[PDB]
Amino acid sequence: VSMTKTSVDCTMYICGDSTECSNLLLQYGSFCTQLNRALTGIAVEQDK
Amino acid sequence: CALDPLSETKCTLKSFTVEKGIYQTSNFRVQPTESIVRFPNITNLCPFG
């Protein structure tokens, strides 16, 4: 019926506390925004 | 976008009006408070003496 509503943010996943890695990820435009929106949609649809 | 949680929600939704709900705005993070380096104690000093 449902699975664990895992919500992996990638700002901490791809990059640790490294701020230079955060900037390098920021070079990629909206990849992590799409990923997080997709995972939150997955979680909300699990609740639904 | 950093004055208050309402402002953070507004800047996340990109809209001046915020609908009734719970919106993820940012991420909480606990910075390391201090640094510790507990290396093993020197078993024997080199024989400079």
XYZ file of N, CA and C in Angstrom:
291
model
N 0.820 -1.204 0.000
C 0.000 0.000 0.000
C 0.856 1.257 0.000
N 1.883 1.290 0.836
C 2.782 2.428 0.887
C 4.169 1.922 1.234
N 5.150 2.792 1.072
C 6.509 2.488 1.471
C 7.003 3.606 2.376
N 8.227 3.458 2.874
C 8.813 4.503 3.697
C 8.879 5.801 2.909
N 8.448 6.892 3.537
C 8.430 8.182 2.863
C 9.805 8.825 2.907
N 10.818 8.112 2.426
C 12.168 8.650 2.406
C 12.195 9.949 1.618
N 12.826 10.968 2.191
C 12.938 12.287 1.578
C 14.405 12.693 1.635
N 15.161 12.300 0.620
C 16.592 12.558 0.574
C 16.830 13.919 -0.058
N 17.178 14.902 0.763
C 17.732 16.130 0.222
C 19.127 15.848 -0.319
N 19.459 16.480 -1.440
C 20.748 16.176 -2.040
C 21.814 17.213 -1.740
N 21.438 18.367 -1.190
C 22.451 19.329 -0.778
C 23.386 18.730 0.262
N 22.860 17.891 1.157
C 23.692 17.159 2.101
C 24.155 15.812 1.569
N 23.449 15.238 0.596
C 23.831 13.925 0.094
C 25.042 14.019 -0.826
N 24.916 14.759 -1.930
C 26.024 14.843 -2.875
C 27.213 15.535 -2.234
N 26.950 16.517 -1.383
C 27.988 17.318 -0.758
C 27.808 17.286 0.750
N 28.911 17.155 1.475
C 28.837 17.187 2.920
C 28.675 18.605 3.423
N 29.400 18.960 4.478
C 29.412 20.351 4.907
C 30.252 21.235 3.998
N 30.808 20.685 2.921
C 31.680 21.447 2.038
C 30.892 22.512 1.287
N 31.276 23.776 1.479
C 30.598 24.881 0.812
C 30.997 25.005 -0.653
N 32.241 24.660 -0.991
C 32.647 24.656 -2.392
C 31.848 23.631 -3.184
N 31.609 22.460 -2.593
C 30.738 21.481 -3.229
C 29.320 22.016 -3.357
N 28.864 22.786 -2.367
C 27.543 23.398 -2.467
C 27.471 24.351 -3.652
N 28.515 25.157 -3.855
C 28.542 26.049 -5.012
C 28.573 25.262 -6.317
N 29.381 24.200 -6.370
C 29.453 23.392 -7.583
C 28.102 22.772 -7.910
N 27.379 22.317 -6.889
C 26.022 21.835 -7.109
C 25.126 22.974 -7.576
N 25.315 24.169 -7.010
C 24.539 25.330 -7.425
C 24.768 25.680 -8.886
N 25.901 25.271 -9.459
C 26.091 25.436 -10.897
C 25.003 24.703 -11.671
N 24.709 23.466 -11.277
C 23.573 22.747 -11.836
C 22.289 23.433 -11.400
N 21.474 23.828 -12.369
C 20.410 24.773 -12.100
C 19.356 24.340 -11.105
N 18.529 23.371 -11.480
C 17.380 23.006 -10.665
C 17.282 21.499 -10.492
N 18.413 20.797 -10.570
C 18.383 19.346 -10.427
C 17.889 18.944 -9.046
N 18.464 19.537 -7.998
C 18.075 19.146 -6.650
C 16.688 19.648 -6.287
N 16.255 20.773 -6.853
C 14.880 21.205 -6.633
C 13.896 20.192 -7.206
N 14.153 19.717 -8.429
C 13.299 18.686 -9.012
C 13.355 17.401 -8.203
N 14.551 16.996 -7.771
C 14.678 15.753 -7.017
C 13.907 15.830 -5.708
N 14.049 16.942 -4.987
C 13.361 17.092 -3.713
C 11.858 17.218 -3.906
N 11.417 17.928 -4.949
C 9.986 18.013 -5.217
C 9.418 16.649 -5.578
N 10.161 15.864 -6.359
C 9.716 14.520 -6.704
C 9.618 13.640 -5.471
N 10.608 13.716 -4.582
C 10.579 12.867 -3.397
C 9.500 13.312 -2.415
N 9.259 14.619 -2.300
C 8.165 15.079 -1.452
C 6.816 14.712 -2.050
N 6.692 14.752 -3.376
C 5.479 14.259 -4.002
C 5.284 12.777 -3.765
N 6.376 12.013 -3.797
C 6.305 10.593 -3.470
C 5.813 10.407 -2.042
N 6.358 11.181 -1.104
C 5.966 11.032 0.295
C 4.515 11.446 0.524
N 4.090 12.557 -0.075
C 2.703 12.985 0.069
C 1.765 11.973 -0.566
N 2.163 11.379 -1.691
C 1.315 10.356 -2.277
C 1.374 9.056 -1.496
N 2.419 8.821 -0.696
C 2.384 7.685 0.225
C 1.368 7.920 1.330
N 1.358 9.129 1.892
C 0.338 9.460 2.882
C -1.054 9.356 2.274
N -1.209 9.836 1.043
C -2.484 9.730 0.349
C -2.811 8.285 0.002
N 13.688 36.835 2.634
C 13.865 35.394 2.571
C 14.548 34.831 3.806
N 15.006 35.682 4.726
C 15.647 35.203 5.943
C 15.211 35.984 7.175
N 14.200 36.845 7.063
C 13.735 37.598 8.222
C 12.964 36.708 9.189
N 12.065 35.878 8.670
C 11.182 35.083 9.511
C 10.686 33.893 8.702
N 10.175 32.853 9.368
C 9.696 31.671 8.631
C 8.622 31.969 7.600
N 7.745 32.942 7.852
C 6.787 33.340 6.826
C 7.502 33.861 5.587
N 8.549 34.659 5.785
C 9.323 35.165 4.660
C 10.022 34.034 3.917
N 10.538 33.047 4.652
C 11.169 31.903 4.004
C 10.163 31.115 3.174
N 8.948 30.928 3.696
C 7.906 30.256 2.924
C 7.541 31.052 1.678
N 7.442 32.378 1.806
C 7.145 33.212 0.645
C 8.226 33.081 -0.417
N 9.491 33.070 -0.001
C 10.576 32.993 -0.972
C 10.700 31.597 -1.565
N 10.268 30.571 -0.828
C 10.259 29.221 -1.381
C 9.131 29.023 -2.386
N 7.932 29.506 -2.075
C 6.806 29.388 -2.989
C 6.886 30.355 -4.160
N 7.801 31.325 -4.116
C 7.915 32.370 -5.133
C 6.628 33.177 -5.263
N 5.810 33.192 -4.213
C 4.525 33.873 -4.247
C 4.351 34.714 -2.993
N 3.753 35.894 -3.161
C 3.498 36.772 -2.028
C 2.407 36.236 -1.115
N 1.457 35.484 -1.655
C 0.413 34.851 -0.866
C 0.768 33.385 -0.679
N 0.638 32.897 0.550
C 1.021 31.536 0.900
C -0.241 30.792 1.312
N -0.516 29.679 0.639
C -1.707 28.902 0.938
C -1.544 28.159 2.260
N -2.675 27.746 2.826
C -2.671 27.092 4.128
C -2.101 25.686 4.008
N -0.953 25.462 4.632
C -0.311 24.166 4.577
C 1.047 24.217 5.239
N 1.773 23.115 5.091
C 3.122 22.970 5.622
C 4.081 22.852 4.447
N 5.013 23.794 4.347
C 5.911 23.890 3.203
C 7.343 23.786 3.697
N 8.103 22.859 3.127
C 9.514 22.771 3.463
C 10.247 23.964 2.872
N 10.877 24.759 3.734
C 11.535 25.991 3.321
C 13.047 25.857 3.242
N 13.668 25.250 4.243
C 15.112 25.083 4.258
C 15.424 23.812 5.037
N 16.680 23.655 5.436
C 17.122 22.473 6.156
C 17.809 22.887 7.445
N 17.409 22.267 8.549
C 18.084 22.469 9.820
C 19.399 21.706 9.832
N 20.409 22.291 10.465
C 21.745 21.705 10.476
C 22.459 22.179 11.730
N 23.096 21.258 12.445
C 23.847 21.596 13.649
C 25.323 21.649 13.280
N 25.910 22.838 13.356
C 27.319 22.986 13.047
C 28.169 22.330 14.133
N 29.352 21.834 13.777
C 30.263 21.300 14.797
C 30.689 22.390 15.768
N 30.449 22.144 17.056
C 30.720 23.156 18.069
C 32.212 23.314 18.335
N 32.978 22.229 18.241
C 34.394 22.275 18.577
C 35.112 21.160 17.828
N 36.436 21.131 17.972
C 37.291 20.158 17.306
C 38.145 19.436 18.339
N 38.169 18.106 18.266
C 38.957 17.273 19.168
C 39.771 16.283 18.347
N 41.022 16.075 18.750
C 41.929 15.143 18.080
C 42.576 14.306 19.182
N 42.006 13.131 19.452
C 42.488 12.257 20.519
C 43.327 11.148 19.888
N 44.532 11.518 19.473
C 45.511 10.574 18.963
C 46.050 9.715 20.104
N 46.505 8.494 19.813
C 47.104 7.669 20.872
C 48.361 8.314 21.433
N 48.571 8.134 22.735
C 49.728 8.731 23.387
C 51.011 8.099 22.865
N 52.053 8.924 22.740
C 53.343 8.443 22.261
C 53.848 7.340 23.176
N 54.010 6.141 22.614
C 54.513 5.019 23.397
C 55.947 5.257 23.851
N 56.786 5.805 22.974
C 58.176 6.068 23.322
C 58.697 7.213 22.470
N 59.365 8.165 23.114
C 60.045 9.230 22.395
C 61.272 8.677 21.678
N 61.579 9.258 20.522
C 62.771 8.856 19.795
C 64.012 9.178 20.627
N 65.080 8.380 20.497
C 66.263 8.544 21.363
C 67.167 9.697 20.934
N 66.643 10.921 21.033
C 67.491 12.095 20.866
C 68.367 12.322 22.090
N 67.907 11.883 23.263
C 68.697 12.059 24.470
C 70.030 11.338 24.409
